[PDB]
Design a protein around this ligand. Structure first.
Ligand code: CLA
Ligand code: CLA
Ligand code: CLA
Ligand code: CLA
Ligand code: CLA
Ligand code: CLA
Ligand code: CLA
Ligand SMILES: CCCCCCCCCCCCCCCC(=O)OC[C@H](COP(=O)(O)OC[C@@H](O)CO)OC(=O)CCCCCCCCCCCCCCC
Ligand SMILES: CC1=C(/C=C/C(C)=C/C=C/C(C)=C/C=C/C=C(C)/C=C/C=C(C)/C=C/C2=C(C)CCCC2(C)C)C(C)(C)CCC1
Ligand SMILES: CC1=C(C/C=C(\C)CCC[C@H](C)CCC[C@H](C)CCCC(C)C)C(=O)c2ccccc2C1=O
Ligand SMILES: CC1=C(C/C=C(\C)CCC[C@H](C)CCC[C@H](C)CCCC(C)C)C(=O)c2ccccc2C1=O
Ligand code: SF4
Ligand code: SF4
Lengths: 137, 740, 167, 73, 43, 33, 80, 134
């Protein structure tokens, strides 16, 4: 809402497309940019306003980038957790945090392509009352 | 006694110590039980005094470390000359220096940096530099890119050559201690060869290469027609036509008929009207005179032939009535502590760097420098800040010498011991001066600010109202204008037109003109002295009270760098010699940030501007400095609010990054206030609760996390506080003049 | 070699004579005897000032002190104060100067009523100064400061205002 | 000042002024009854924040009123 | 030996620097060809 | 009626501080309270 | 002025008494048959609250504590 | 108190008006050799061959000096407290043994038989004049 219209009907978007300001080395990068942003909704400024409501029509605004992060983010955290727990079994744990043991890390880094499958499998994520409880309350 | 003694194969060159971190220290070599080990690894990497109790190993590390540093500076310089060759408009600037801006960078055509590649003239789209290397290389006579290309390669070869030296010396051929302690041999060699012969050889350049090339180029001949430097040596007819003094040859030199060389060794004492800059012949006569002085000055000391002084002898003789033994024992401290040497060298080299900037603006020593107002402020502002940093370092190491290397046996009733024994009188009186000035320097601004708001403009301290004229400076100014006639009569023009004379006009721009001094200029000079005095109060107190105090008598055993003693005694917070330096940096800033504005606003208002052929000068801000620089609101209105319009409006232009850099610094600045205002006690408790969450999900780290140390928190803040401050006015200075 | 190098150790050298000494004979004490602090000229001047002069009553001291300050404080208010360019410029200085004397006398009697600890002894004045160690002495000093201060300002007003007639 | 610079630097500075006043000849007559010491650690925090807050208040007030009043919206 | 050199790269800064350079190069090189992607286009 | 401000302003700025500070100083410096 | 309290978890390191600048602490014999010694705080007027002893005691939490209280010339470390 | 003062020209840092009015201190020690030692407050001084004496403002300066004397292997450092009336008390060692080495004559004081965690809550002792640590 808020006086939000499609692009082509909006005169502001039609004017900004002329002033290209080509980003990349390609001469037609500016024209290709504005043509691609024709799909989005444009306000009085002509700048596209993205709707992150959750509409399947506007899924590319937030929904598709959103899933792309969490798959990557869980890859990073799940790899760091498994590498950290693996170090704990070895003798000198503090040194491996600094000087990484690639024999342990790189196999673990290879995994994580399916972290949710492993995550749901571990219903015991190490949580107990045996942790740092730290004066009485 | 000054013989060369060298140990052979001191240490191997194995790569295993790289894998072993913290090898240099014993405690760190054990292991990283906590995160503070990581921060301590960096804070002790260069502190060789802590690694070993052996002075010889410390000296060898230092001598080799300097060589690796010169590699960095040479690589930085070799890249500078390289960018001038490939990514630059130098060849176009040479033909049309006034109407073409200097650029040396090309941002790539990616996400949208390309707007930064603005039209700087000469068919080149790039960032407009302000270092002034275009003016430097022109004075060097570099008229083509290949001459510029070859010089870059030599620096890299020179860089690796320095790098090979530190390897050769630390691993293979280590000098012993007695080689380093020969200070008398060091001073002679550096004075005569490094400073003396280096100046003499550079005069060979000015006489053979630069001045003929410059004398041709400013005369109207194109760079295409200018011969190369080698042709002057082979063919003397071209040189004799420009400088007829060479027809006599070298015979007038040895026969003391030095008047024959007056054509190309002048004492004009002024700027060249064509190119805003000092005469090249005056710079040739310059270095030749100074080289003889340096060559002569270096034979003072003895060095194995019985002819020369012992510095120990001279110092011991300079005792007096008030100073019991005078300078007895200083030679031992200077020869037994690297920190004392670093303190003297930093303190005066920093004061030297400040003295350069004051000279370079009034008498531009390069061609086409004053017309480039962008370069002058950036060149002035840069060195002014560098010297301030180094002076503070001189006080820090002065305290480190005390806590570490001060021996009471050596310093017995000498000039130093006698200073420590009355430290209270030195500081108490300096405390009085800082309070005296701060009232009568800043209070006058408040009185003017109060009166102008009250509607009483006749009660202010101003030029029309009550006026405080700097008669002593006006007095000294008048002498230098009248000097070329009577005192030092051989000079034709006054030394600098800043003192007085006439307006010099290069193109439409004014290069330099007399800087009149009034009540407003009176009102700022003392503000520097006031801020400088407080900076000395903080730093000087750090040196004297580092060993002991009435509050703490055992401050030496704790060390130079400790946060406190404890809560009691009312509180022992920031009592160390380190913490004094931490506070002095804020005052080193406030001392310095006003200096660059006093230069920036005045020159825009009184000196820099455009001049008409009739003789009427239209300055940039139109004399607003006279009446507005006597109130704090005028600085806020006419200097900060007004001149910053180009920065905020820089978006969508080539200067748009300055608007970003002007702003990102403000974030980094306030980010400093986290670490200065806060304390570790809060942060470790917060980290404790966060550690529980990781224990819950079994993501607990092996190296147990710890908050930053107390001294580090103060350190990280002042690092941000300064970086956010300097980076802010850095972009404001750039974008203002780059538009204006 | 020059003889100046050989004589550096001898006590006959003019260098080796030391001007600075410990406060009294005890070096543990704070002060240091200096030509500014312990010279006969400075000692005579300070010890014979009204605050330290021997054989004077507390009232006589404040009168000498007040007459000086009253005569001094007239200047800043007249020439540099407001209404400095007007017929009544000198008159404003007389009132403002007497104003400080009242405030100054208030602080004196106010400091007096609060039990003053002591009057300290230093190198420049070895003996204790006077009977300024009691409320009675300080109170008489305050009343004397008021009389002299009002008189001194009037004197500076009379001379300054009637200077042209004196010329 | 009170937030950044902490006590131990200041109390040392105070000891010097105490030395001077006790050793200045004419000012030896007048002396404090209560010994002057630096502000405590918690006191300086209080004094510092009150300054940080008062300036935060008066500054925006003058901008809030004058910007709106001079233009009258 | 070679083992001593490999552990130097295994340390945190060199391991972080090499990995983080590759991460930055991938994003920089993607924005080169595919200039600007505010949203995924909609089939 | 405007003459009241000419009498009330100075006593607030001068008389009241002098009376308060003078009493408070002697009160805090008193040995027995 | 201050109050230095010594708790049961001492083991006789003798580190507290050494770190004290003003000699507020002292090691005394304990009536424990197998306990070698224990610290003490006999002259508490001279405590200057610098908390060096709290840094020296190696127990998991400190057997010795220094609770701040009424100040004086000695506790505030005023030579003047 | 009997001893020779160490030889030093003097210093601004030292005894002040507190010494006359309030409890000046004095340290005594005997030296085997005349040596240069740093003073507690600024400068250096030469101790005499035997029975040195130095007047001191605060007790902290004396014990801080004693730690320096132990570097020169002088362990017979004695401190006194001098009131304005001249009362001198053997203050630092009450008995000849040092504080570090145990002696039967001493007695424990301010000993809390409870552990530190077993201290009562302050709400239990409010409006009573009692303190938690007591
Ligand atoms: C030729 C290769 C080589 C090799 C194998 C060694 C090997 C060794 N050197 Mg050595 N050295 C060399 C060249 C070499 N050096 C050269 C060329 C110099 C002259 C500068 C020195 C000077 C030197 C000194 C003075 C010392 C050593 C020491 C050592 C030992 C420990 C070093 C260590 O673990 O830290 C490894 C550390 C690093 C790899 C980091 C170094 C970073 C470089 C030098 C600077 C980079 C600056 C950079 C531009 C800053 C950018 C900042 C910003 C972008 C973030 C080890 C046996 C030390 C020793 O023996 O200890 C007792 C010692 O004190 N060396
Ligand atoms: C002070 C040292 C210094 C600095 C800050 C720079 C900075 C720069 N150089 Mg450079 N350069 C230097 C020294 C330096 N140079 C020296 C000594 C040489 C000669 C050996 C060169 C030779 C050189 C070339 C040949 C090129 C640059 C380029 C560049 C730019 C891109 C850097 C890049 O892509 O990184 C990449 C970083 C990693 C791969 C890691 C950048 C402005 C490029 C440029 O400006 O293109 C327009 C380019 O093509 N430089
Ligand atoms: C010739 C110059 C010089 C030299 C050789 C030294 C040498 C030394 N200093 Mg020193 N110092 C200097 C100048 C110098 N200083 C100046 C100018 C100052 C005033 C600012 C100081 C202030 C100072 C203090 C306060 C201390 C030292 C200490 C030391 C010693 C250990 C430092 C250490 O471990 O290094 C490693 C140092 C670091 C890792 C600090 C990194 C700081 C970074 C570079 C700040 C960021 C600046 C950067 C430009 C920002 C932009 C880039 C960034 C955003 C990426 C060592 C002997 C220490 C000591 O106790 O000596 C025994 C100490 O506590 N110095
Ligand atoms: C704007 C902020 C500010 C101000 C005004 C001050 C002021 C001062 N600092 Mg300072 N300081 C600050 C920020 C500031 N600091 C910060 C942020 C830091 C941390 C880095 C420090 C760290 C610091 C140190 C480490 C030191 C100082 C010192 C000083 C003093 C220098 C003496 C002087 O200028 O004469 C006093 C001048 C003024 C106070 C200026 C304004 C006075 C006007 C003209 C008069 C007021 C009018 C009237 C009388 C008001 C009466 C009102 C009535 C109703 C009651 C002074 C009290 C030094 C010091 O105390 O030694 C002398 C010192 O060593 N400061
Ligand atoms: C600290 C800096 C400073 C200075 C130098 C002045 C100076 C002045 N102010 Mg001002 N003012 C200041 C700060 C300052 N102001 C601030 C911060 C404010 C804001 C609160 C104001 C607000 C203000 C107002 C509102 C007014 C003034 C006015 C005046 C003028 C009259 C002064 C007067 O009557 O006092 C009289 C002064 C004295 C009685 C004593 C001065 C001290 C003497 C000279 C000391 C000498 C010591 C001596 C050398 C040592 C001897 C050594 C011994 C051994 C012999 C004068 C020009 C008035 C005016 O209209 O201006 C024209 C006025 O109405 N002021
Ligand atoms: C502040 C005093 C002062 C200073 C700094 C100078 C400085 C200088 N004089 Mg000079 N001069 C002075 C007073 C001074 N003069 C007086 C009072 C006289 C008497 C008229 C002279 C007469 C004089 C002569 C005759 C010459 C100099 C020259 C010089 C220059 C080189 C001198 C060498 O050594 C130098 C710039 C020489 C020169 O040519 O100046 C460039 C030279 O030949 N001076
Ligand atoms: C809140 C933080 C935040 C967020 C959410 C974003 C998000 C975005 N930025 Mg942005 N940016 C940020 C911080 C952030 N940035 C910062 C700190 C800066 C510098 C100060 C920038 C500077 C910046 C610029 C200059 C540009 C973006 C662009 C973009 C968009 C496209 C990036 C892209 O192509 O994905 C990467 C592409 C993929 C296909 C994903 C691949 C995933 C992995 C690597 C594959 C394996 C995206 C919406 C671009 C834009 O606006 O395009 C419309 C653009 O040109 N950003
Ligand atoms: C007065 C000039 C110093 C004259 C001077 O220093 O005298 C120098 C005088 C000389 O004593 P000696 O002959 O023993 O010095 C022999 C030298 O070889 C030892 O360095 O010594 C003193 O009187 C000590 C006084 C120092 C303290 C004097 C006050 C300094 C004030 C601060 C500086 C003000 C600078 C203002 C101008 C920029
Ligand atoms: C050189 C010198 C100097 C200087 C000096 C001076 C400058 C002085 C001061 C001056 C002064 C400061 C003076 C004043 C005087 C005053 C007077 C002259 C007074 C008068 C008074 C009167 C006469 C009064 C009376 C009266 C009375 C009391 C009451 C009633 C009224 C009548 C009025 C009657 C000095 C010392 C610093 C230092 C050394 C050297
Ligand atoms: C914030 C703050 C802290 C806490 C600050 C901390 C803990 C800074 C931590 C900085 C880094 C981000 C910690 C983690 C570094 C990791 C190695 C980074 C991950 C590696 C990837 C980035 C590659 C203090 O300890 C402190 C102490 C005294 C006065 C003020 C303060 C203060 O203000
Ligand atoms: C300046 C400063 C001092 C010295 C400041 C002192 C001694 C205060 C001096 C101020 C005098 C008393 C004048 C102040 C007058 C006020 C304008 C009014 C206060 C009165 C109210 C009670 C009404 C500290 O003691 C200190 C301690 C810990 C951290 C930082 C600092 C610190 O920054
Ligand atoms: S636990 Fe503490 S108090 Fe007990 S002996 Fe050890 S250091 Fe002393
Ligand atoms: S605070 Fe600690 S170290 Fe200081 S006197 Fe008291 S017990 Fe001893």
């Amino acid at each position: 809402g808020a006086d939000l219209t499609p692009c082509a009907e909006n005169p502001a978007f039609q004017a900004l497309a002329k002033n290209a300001r080509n980003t990349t080395a390609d001469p037609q990068s500016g024209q290709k940019r504005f043509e691609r942003y024709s799909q989005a909704l444009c306000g009085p400024e002509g700048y596209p306003h993205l709707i992150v409501d959750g509409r399947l029509d506007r899924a590319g605004d937030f929904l598709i980038p959103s899933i792309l992060f969490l798959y990557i983010a869980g890859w990073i955290g799940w790899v760091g957790r498994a590498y950290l727990q693996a170090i704990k079994k070895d003798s000198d744990t503090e040194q491996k945090e600094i000087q990484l043991d690639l024999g342990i890390a790189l196999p673990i880094i290879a995994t994580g392509f399916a972290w949710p499958a492993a995550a749901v499998k571990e219903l015991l994520s190490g949580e107990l009352t045996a942790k740092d409880s730290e004066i009485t309350v | 006694k000054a013989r060369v003694i060298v140990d052979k194969d001191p240490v191997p060159t194995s790569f295993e110590k790289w894998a072993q971190p913290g090898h240099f220290d014993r405690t760190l070599a054990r292991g990283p039980k906590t995160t503070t080990w990581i921060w301590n690894l960096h804070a002790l990497a260069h502190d060789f005094d802590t690694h070993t109790s052996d002075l010889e190993d410390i000296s060898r590390k230092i001598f080799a470390a300097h060589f690796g540093h010169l590699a960095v500076v040479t690589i930085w310089l070799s890249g500078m000359i390289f960018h001038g060759a490939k990514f630059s408009n130098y060849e176009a600037w040479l033909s049309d220096p006034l109407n073409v801006r200097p650029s040396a960078q090309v941002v790539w055509p990616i996400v949208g940096q390309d707007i930064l590649n603005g039209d700087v003239g000469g068919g080149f789209h790039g960032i407009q530099i302000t270092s002034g290397l275009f003016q430097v290389w022109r004075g060097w006579g570099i008229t083509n890119s290949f001459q510029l290309y070859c010089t870059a390669i030599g620096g890299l070869v020179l860089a690796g050559l320095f790098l090979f030296a530190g390897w050769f010396h630390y691993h293979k051929r280590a000098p012993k201690l007695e080689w380093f302690q020969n200070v008398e041999s060091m001073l002679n060699h550096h004075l005569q060869v490094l400073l003396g012969c280096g100046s003499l050889g550079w005069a060979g350049h000015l006489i053979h290469v630069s001045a003929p090339i410059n004398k041709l180029m400013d005369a109207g001949v194109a760079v295409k027609d200018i011969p190369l430097p080698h042709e002057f040596i082979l063919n003397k007819s071209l040189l004799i036509d420009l400088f007829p003094g060479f027809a006599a040859g070298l015979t007038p030199f040895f026969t003391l008929n030095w008047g024959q060389y007056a054509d190309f060794l002048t004492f004009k004492g002024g700027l060249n009207p064509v190119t805003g800059g000092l005469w090249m012949t005056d710079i040739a006569h310059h270095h030749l005179a100074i080289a003889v002085v340096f060559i002569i000055a270096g034979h003072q000391y003895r060095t194995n032939w019985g002819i020369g002084h012992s510095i120990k002898e001279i110092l011991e003789n300079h005792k007096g009535p008030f100073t019991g033994e005078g300078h007895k024992g200083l030679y031992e401290n200077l020869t037994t502590s690297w920190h004392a040497q670093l303190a003297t060298n930093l303190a005066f080299l920093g004061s030297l760097t400040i003295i350069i900037a004051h000279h370079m603006y009034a008498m531009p020593p390069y061609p086409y420098l004053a017309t480039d107002y962008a370069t002058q402020l950036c060149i002035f502002t840069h060195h002014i800040w560098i010297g301030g940093f180094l002076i503070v370092g001189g006080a820090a190491h002065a305290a480190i010498f005390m806590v570490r290397d001060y021996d009471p046996v050596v310093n017995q009733n000498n000039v130093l011991d006698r200073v420590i024994r009355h430290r209270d009188a030195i500081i108490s009186h300096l405390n009085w001066v800082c309070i005296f000035l701060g009232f009568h320097s800043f209070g006058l601004y408040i009185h003017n600010d109060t009166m102008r708001a009250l509607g009483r403009p006749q009660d202010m301290f101003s030029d029309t109202a009550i006026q405080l004229q700097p008669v002593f400076a006006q007095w000294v100014q008048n002498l230098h204008t009248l000097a070329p006639g009577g005192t030092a009569p051989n000079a034709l023009e006054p030394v600098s037109y800043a003192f007085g004379g006439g307006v010099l006009a290069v193109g439409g721009k004014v290069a330099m003109m007399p800087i009149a001094l009034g009540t407003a200029d009176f009102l700022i000079h003392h503000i520097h002295a006031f801020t400088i005095h407080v900076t000395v109060l903080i730093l000087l107190k750090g040196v004297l009270f580092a060993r002991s105090s009435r509050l703490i008598p055992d401050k030496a055993n704790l060390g130079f760098r400790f946060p406190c003693d404890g809560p009691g005694r009312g509180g022992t917070c920031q009592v160390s010699g380190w913490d004094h330096v931490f506070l002095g940096l804020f005052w080193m800033y406030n001392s310095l940030s006003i200096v660059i504005f006093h230069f920036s606003w005045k020159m825009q208002s009184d000196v820099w501007g455009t001049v008409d052929a009739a003789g009427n000068v239209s300055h940039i801000t139109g004399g607003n400095f006279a009446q507005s620089a006597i109130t704090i609101n005028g600085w806020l209105r006419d200097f900060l609010w007004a001149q910053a319009s180009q920065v905020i409006n820089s978006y969508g232009s080539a200067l748009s990054a300055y608007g970003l850099m002007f702003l990102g610094a403000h974030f980094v600045w306030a980010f400093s206030l986290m670490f200065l205002f806060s304390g570790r006690g809060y942060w470790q408790e917060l980290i404790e609760s966060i550690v529980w969450a990781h224990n819950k999900l079994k993501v607990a780290p092996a190296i147990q996390p710890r908050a930053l140390s107390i001294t580090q928190g103060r350190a990280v803040g002042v690092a941000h506080y300064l970086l956010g401050g300097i980076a802010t006015t850095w972009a404001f200075f750039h974008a203002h003049i780059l538009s204006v | 070699a020059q003889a100046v190098d050989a004589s550096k150790n001898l006590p006959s050298d003019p260098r080796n004579r030391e001007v600075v000494f410990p406060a009294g004979r005890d070096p543990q004490w704070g002060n240091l005897e200096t030509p500014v602090n312990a010279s006969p000229l400075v000692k005579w001047f300070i010890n014979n000032l009204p605050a330290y002069r021997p054989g004077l009553t507390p009232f006589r001291r404040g009168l000498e002190v007040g007459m000086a300050h009253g005569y001094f404080l007239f200047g800043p208010f007249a020439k540099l104060g407001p209404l400095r360019d007007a017929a009544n410029a000198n008159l404003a200085g007389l009132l403002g100067a007497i104003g400080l004397v009242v405030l100054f006398t208030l602080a004196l009697s106010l400091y007096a009523n609060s039990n003053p600890p002591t009057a300290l002894a230093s190198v420049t004045v070895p003996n204790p100064p006077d009977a300024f160690q009691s409320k009675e002495g300080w109170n008489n000093f305050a009343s004397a400061f008021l009389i002299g201060g009002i008189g001194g300002a009037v004197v500076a007003y009379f001379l300054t205002s009637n200077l042209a007639l004196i010329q | 000042m009170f937030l950044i610079s902490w006590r131990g630097y200041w109390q040392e500075l105070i000891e010097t002024l105490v030395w001077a006043h006790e050793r200045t000849p004419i000012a030896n007559l007048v002396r404090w009854k209560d010994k002057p010491v630096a502000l405590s650690i918690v006191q300086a925090r209080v004094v510092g924040l009150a300054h940080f807050t008062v300036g935060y208040v008066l500054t925006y007030a003058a901008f809030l009123i004058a910007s709106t009043a001079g233009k009258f919206g | 030996q070679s083992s001593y050199l490999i552990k130097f790269i295994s340390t945190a800064p060199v391991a972080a620097t090499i990995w983080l350079t590759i991460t930055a190069g991938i994003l920089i090189e993607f924005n080169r060809f595919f200039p600007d992607l505010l949203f995924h286009p909609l089939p | 009626a405007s003459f009241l401000s000419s009498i009330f302003v100075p006593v607030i700025g001068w008389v009241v501080p002098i009376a308060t500070f003078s009493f408070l100083f002697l009160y805090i410096e008193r040995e027995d309270v | 002025s201050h109050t230095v309290k010594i708790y049961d978890t001492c083991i006789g390191c003798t580190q507290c008494v050494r770190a004290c600048p003003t000699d507020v602490l002292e090691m005394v014999p304990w009536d424990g048959c197998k306990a070698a010694q224990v610290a003490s705080s006999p002259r508490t007027e001279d405590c200057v609250g610098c908390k060096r002893c709290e840094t020296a005691c190696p127990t998991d939490f400190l057997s010795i504590r220094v609770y701040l209280g009424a100040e004086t010339t000695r506790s505030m470390g005023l030579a003047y | 108190l009997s001893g020779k003062t160490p030889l030093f020209a003097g210093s601004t840092g030292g005894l002040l008006t507190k010494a006359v009015e309030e409890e000046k201190y004095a340290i005594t020690w005997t030296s085997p050799k005349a040596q240069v030692f740093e003073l507690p407050t600024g400068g250096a001084a030469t101790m005499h061959e035997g029975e040195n004496l130095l007047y001191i403002a605060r007790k902290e300066y004396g014990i801080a000096l004693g730690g320096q004397l132990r570097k020169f292997k002088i362990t017979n450092y004695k401190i006194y407290r001098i009131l304005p009336s001249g009362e001198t008390t053997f203050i630092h060692p009450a008995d000849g043994v040092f504080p570090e080495k145990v002696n039967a004559g001493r007695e424990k004081v301010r000993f809390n038989a409870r552990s530190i965690g077993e201290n009562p809550n302050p709400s239990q002792v409010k409006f009573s004049g009692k303190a938690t640590y007591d």
